[PDB]
Amino acid sequence: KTVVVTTILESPYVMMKKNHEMLEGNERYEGYCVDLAAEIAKHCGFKYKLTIVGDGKYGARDADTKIWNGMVGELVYGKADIAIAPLTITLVREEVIDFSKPFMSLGISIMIKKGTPIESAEDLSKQTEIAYGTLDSGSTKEFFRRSKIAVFDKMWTYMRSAEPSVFVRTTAEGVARVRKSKGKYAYLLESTMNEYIEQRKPCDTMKVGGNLDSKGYGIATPKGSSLGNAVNLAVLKLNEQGLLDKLKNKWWYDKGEC
């Protein structure tokens, strides 16, 4: 009867509080998705325990074994009752679990080190002097790889052919690369992460240009889960009570340095 919530350690969505070793259970964690979890539970009348996804992954099906990892795997294989994380709503996932309507929208955007003479994807496309790239594996890369749009296609062919490599293994590396490259590298990533980092010391980065695309984060439950309907309704209510906006403002701006 205690609901098992699975999530993932990703700031500012879910973080381990500074004195977590002095804290018990759910109080070890803070962040946007921790509050969201609490808000969901209140409007759904259930008790819950926060767990961190065992393998540190989101949810991907291995082409060969067909096994799901991450949070999606924890739902499908019955370790968790529900996922409350920055888990993107995608077709392959929707086919094996239920999604709430998205609690947050986002898109591909450009992170620059402040000073950089770039204001848009187009700016990036027309030049090579400032290197730019994405995570070496994931949707942003595939977006570029698959786009039929001129600008985005010129960016991809550029990125694929660039030497040395413009791809990074981790988000943290991308951001470092920006910060360390003295304004000669730009990074493509979730507008949400871009916005968050903009509010981080040493305050030396900046989101520019519009979003290139659009996707959504949703709460995830097993197909036919008794929780999903209430959970989805709770998402919509929260949005209409200004609460999701308030949460975002909280973790991004009110608690922002810079």
Ligand X SMILES: O=C(O)C[C@@]12O[C@H]3C=CCN[C@H]3[C@@H]1C(=O)N[C@H]2C(=O)O
Q: Tell me which of 105, 128, 137, 226 binds its own copies, using CB under 8 A.
A: 105
Least Cβ distance, residue 214 to its own copies (angstroms): 6
> Is position 93 annotated in a ligand binding site?
yes
Stretch of 7-15, 18-26, 78-86, 140-148 contacting its own copies, by CB under 8 A: 140-148
Choices 68-76, 125-133, 182-190, 207-215; region in contact with its own copies by CB under 8 A? 207-215
218 near ligand X, judged by CB under 6 A: no
3-state secondary structure 21-72: HHCCHHHHEECHHHHHHHHHHHCCCCEEEEEECCCCCCCCECCCCCCECHHH
Judge contact between 174 and 113, C-beta under 8 A.
no
SS3 199: coil
- Residue closest to ligand X, measured at CB: 138
H-type alpha helices, the chain: 32-42, 70-76, 91-94, 121-125, 139-146, 150-161, 171-180, 191-198, 228-240, 243-248
Which residue stretch of 39-47, 124-132, 133-141, 235-243 sits at the interface with ligand X (rule: CB under 6 A)?
133-141
Helix orientation angle between 228-240 and 32-42, rounded to the nearest 10 degrees: 110
Q: Which is nearer to its own copies, 105 or 157 (CB)?
A: 105
Residue ranges of the annotated binding site are 86, 88, 93, 139-140, 190
Residues that bind its own copies (CB under 8 A): 89-91, 94-95, 99, 101-102, 105, 146-149, 213-216, 218, 232-233, 236-237, 239-242, 244-245
